[PDB]
Every structure is written in structure tokens, then in C-alpha cells.
Design a protein around this motif. Structure first.
Motif, PDB file in Angstrom:
ATOM      1  N   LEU A 100      19.408  17.679 -11.940  1.00 39.90           N
ATOM      2  CA  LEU A 100      19.029  18.002 -13.321  1.00 39.90           C
ATOM      3  C   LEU A 100      17.929  17.079 -13.842  1.00 39.90           C
ATOM      4  O   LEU A 100      17.012  17.530 -14.543  1.00 39.90           O
ATOM      5  N   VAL A 101      17.994  15.790 -13.507  1.00 45.42           N
ATOM      6  CA  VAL A 101      17.004  14.849 -14.022  1.00 45.42           C
ATOM      7  C   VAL A 101      15.597  15.230 -13.556  1.00 45.42           C
ATOM      8  O   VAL A 101      14.631  15.149 -14.329  1.00 45.42           O
ATOM      9  N   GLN A 102      15.459  15.673 -12.297  1.00 41.32           N
ATOM     10  CA  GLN A 102      14.150  16.092 -11.793  1.00 41.32           C
ATOM     11  C   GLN A 102      13.708  17.417 -12.407  1.00 41.32           C
ATOM     12  O   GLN A 102      12.509  17.625 -12.626  1.00 41.32           O
ATOM     13  N   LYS A 103      14.642  18.327 -12.696  1.00 38.37           N
ATOM     14  CA  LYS A 103      14.262  19.476 -13.518  1.00 38.37           C
ATOM     15  C   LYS A 103      13.727  19.026 -14.875  1.00 38.37           C
ATOM     16  O   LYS A 103      12.718  19.551 -15.355  1.00 38.37           O
ATOM     17  N   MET A 104      14.363  18.038 -15.499  1.00 40.15           N
ATOM     18  CA  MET A 104      13.866  17.601 -16.805  1.00 40.15           C
ATOM     19  C   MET A 104      12.495  16.942 -16.701  1.00 40.15           C
ATOM     20  O   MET A 104      11.687  17.073 -17.626  1.00 40.15           O
ATOM     21  N   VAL A 105      12.210  16.241 -15.593  1.00 43.78           N
ATOM     22  CA  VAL A 105      10.854  15.735 -15.367  1.00 43.78           C
ATOM     23  C   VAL A 105       9.870  16.893 -15.312  1.00 43.78           C
ATOM     24  O   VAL A 105       8.803  16.875 -15.952  1.00 43.78           O
ATOM     25  N   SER A 106      10.234  17.930 -14.563  1.00 50.67           N
ATOM     26  CA  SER A 106       9.425  19.137 -14.485  1.00 50.67           C
ATOM     27  C   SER A 106       9.227  19.783 -15.856  1.00 50.67           C
ATOM     28  O   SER A 106       8.110  20.191 -16.196  1.00 50.67           O
TER      29      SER A 106
END
Length: 372
Positions: A96-102
Motif C-alpha cells: 500500500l505504501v508504494q501505491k501511495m507513492v505512486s
């Protein structure tokens, strides 16, 4: 007769938004008060659907609808379960954290080419980031690792509206509060950025970020790398962590003073301030030499502590300046009633010593608004 919204249907609401471009079900959930009893069942593919929907709406520039999605995830975050396990932690494990970076990366075009719908959207994004930060050590580590460089880059980028930078910088200082070549470059550009950001609140937050990320001992050397001017490097090295808030005022007053006509923040001592008929209270530490008012040439605001008060130029209907009884009175007529320390009014009055150059500084922040 009225259809009742069902929180247990959160994922189906997301499906309706994705497949039908119908946000009414999701919006109806936003009117329910979340009860710690309720269990929302979500699938293994919930995160993928969130990612698909948010990226699509970002691509469409549907700012306020991105906000509504981000708020739904955060509000329900502690009641979601995926195959029996904690929903937020499963999504963290699904990336999820990398989706939020995206999502933040996919917001950059919007962040640049801009109203306050964007302001709220980014605030909603960081609010969700803080929920992930606070839920475990893993979510916290990934948030720190991914978003500290993003926020610094955002704060350094002069193209970004100051309110977005202020929101991001304050979330970053909150993240550092609980707790690399790229960082060293960013921190050096952050130091440079203090000199011309032209907003006192951003100046403090950057100084605060730099001092949270570096030891007082290290700053004895880094001050001379970060600030070309010896006068400024010397003042920076004197900031003591244990008296940070007042030493930071001292440092910034020195920096903005030494920059002369190049400064982008003008700080004047003020005799007394009023909202309507009510006198505002001066902060009295034993250490703040004066009641300071900050004129912010970058952000076109006037700000001061009493609680921080900020007056943006779009809120000012007009102003005038008059000299009487050896005082200079700056009277700001605001476009609407405001409330400060449980008092309300439509006009702010600042009394200054008559030797102070109120007229020429004020026209740099509230251009074209003086009534003679």
C-alpha cells in the motif's frame, strides 16, 4: 423508504465507482458514523481496485472525488478485514505504501498546474499516510523511507503553492517527531531554500526539519556547507535544540535581516494588535524580544503568533495606513468575519512604531489593495 447505506458494502461501493462511475453509494457511506463494533469484509483484490480507481480519477483531474476515496479508506481503515486478518496491515503487506507513492507521483501534474480542492486532496492523502504510519513499525518504516525525500523535494520546488508545501512540511516534522547522497543534496537545497522561500512558517518548518534530522554537533560543520554567507552559517550553528522555538526566531530574524533588500520575509516588531475591538494577546516567553509580525513576500500573507494567525492576500478587501499619536496603524479590512481566540471580527489593526516602513513592505504582500 430511504435506502440505508451499509458500511459492510464498502468494496461494492468501490466497484460501483469503478464500473459504473457512480459515487453515490460511496458518498452515502461517508454520512455514517463508524462504530468500533462493525467489521467490513474486503477481498484480496481491494487494494488493486483502490489503486485503479484513484489513478483513473487523478488522470481525469477529478480532484474532489480523489479526496472522497482517500477519506473513505482512512475512516474505515481500522474496521476492514481481509480473509480474517487486519485489513490495513494486509494492504501494507500487499504494498500500500508504494501505491501511495505512486498516487502522490500521479498528483504532481495537478500540484504544479494549480484551487483549494487540490489543497484538501493532498491533505487527505497525507492524513491517510499518517494512519498507515501509526498502525505498525512496518508501515512507519516504509512511510519514512519513501516520503521524507518526496516531501523535501516538494518543499524545495518553488513552483508548488505555499499551502501545499506547508501541509507537507508539517506532516514531515510530525513523522520525524516520533522517530545517503540524495538526502545530503536535498538538505543542502533546503538550506538554500530558507533564504528565498518568502514565508516565515515554511522557514521555521525547514529549519525544524533540518534540526530534527541532524545532531547539534553535526550542524557545526553542515552550517558551513549549507550557507555560503559566513554571517548566516555562524547564526545557524548557534541554534540549540533545547531552546529551539525561540532560537529559531532569533536565527531567522538574523537571516532575513542580513539579506537586506534581497530578503523575502520582512519581520517588524508590533506595539499592539486588534481584531475588531478586541486586543489580541502577545506571546510572552521571557525570550522573544518583541511581538513579531511577519510579512511574507513569497506567499503574499501576513502572519504572526498570538497560535499562528495567517492572513492571505485573497482575504483582504482593502487596507489603509495612518500615522497618529506617533504610531503607524495598519488597518486590514477582511472580506469576511474571522475568529481568533474565541473573538470575531472583520478588521485587523496593527500598531507600529512610526519609524517602521509599513507602507512599502505592505504593498509587496497585498499589492493593489491600499486605500488612501
Amino acid at each position: 423508504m430511504p435506502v440505508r447505506p451499509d458500511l459492510q458494502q464498502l468494496e461494492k461501493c468501490i466497484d460501483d465507482a469503478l464500473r459504473k462511475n457512480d459515487f453515490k453509494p460511496l458518498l452515502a457511506l461517508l454520512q455514517i458514523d463508524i462504530c468500533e463494533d462493525v467489521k467490513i469484509k474486503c477481498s484480496k483484490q481491494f487494494l488493486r481496485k483502490l489503486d485503479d480507481l484513484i489513478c483513473r480519477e487523478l488522470n481525469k483531474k477529478d480532484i474532489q472525488t480523489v479526496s472522497s476515496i482517500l477519506i473513505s479508506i482512512g475512516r474505515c481503515s481500522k474496521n476492514i478485514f481481509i480473509l480474517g486478518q487486519a485489513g490495513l496491515q494486509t494492504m501494507i503487506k500487499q504494498g500500500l505504501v508504494q501505491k501511495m507513492v505512486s498516487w502522490f507521483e500521479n498528483s504532481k501534474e495537478i500540484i504544479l498546474n494549480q484551487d483549494e480542492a487540490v489543497m484538501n486532496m493532498i491533505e487527505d492523502l497525507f492524513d491517510l499516510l499518517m494512519v498507515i504510519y501509526d498502525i505498525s513499525d512496518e508501515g512507519k518504516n516504509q512511510v519514512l523511507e519513501s516520503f521524507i525525500p518526496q516531501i523535501c523535494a516538494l518543499v524545495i520546488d518553488s513552483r508548488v503553492n505555499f499551502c501545499i508545501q506547508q501541509e507537507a512540511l508539517k506532516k514531515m516534522n510530525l513523522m520525524l517527531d516520533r522517530i545517503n547522497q540524495e538526502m545530503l543534496t536535498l538538505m543542502s537545497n533546503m538550506g538554500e531554500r530558507i533564504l528565498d522561500v518568502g514565508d516565515y512558517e515554511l522557514q521555521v518548518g525547514i529549519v525544524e526539519a533540518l534540526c530534527r534530522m541532524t545532531t547539534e554537533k553535526r550542524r557545526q560543520e553542515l552550517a558551513y556547507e549549507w550557507f555560503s554567507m559566513d554571517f548566516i552559517a555562524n547564526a545557524f550553528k548557534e541554534i540549540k535544540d533545547c531552546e529551539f522555538e525561540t532560537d529559531c526566531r532569533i536565527f531567522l530574524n538574523l537571516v532575513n535581516g542580513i539579506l537586506g533588500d534581497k530578503r523575502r520575509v520582512y519581520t517588524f516588531p508590533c506595539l499592539s494588535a486588534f481584531l475588531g475591538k478586541y486586543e489580541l494577546q502577545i506571546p510572552s516567553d521571557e525570550k522573544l524580544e518583541e511581538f513579531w509580525i511577519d510579512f511574507n513576500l513569497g506567499s503574499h500573507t501576513l502572519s504572526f503568533y498570538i497560535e499562528a494567525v495567517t492572513v492571505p492576500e485573497e482575504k483582504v478587501q482593502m487596507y489603509n495606513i495612518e500615522v497618529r499619536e506617533s504610531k503607524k496603524l495598519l488597518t486590514l479590512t477582511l472580506k469576511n468575519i474571522v475568529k481568533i481566540s474565541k473573538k470575531e471580527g472583520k478588521e485587523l489593526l496593527f500598531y507600529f512604531d512610526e519609524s517602521l516602513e509599513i507602507t512599502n513592505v505592505t504593498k509587496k504582500v497585498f499589492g493593489g489593495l491600499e486605500h488612501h
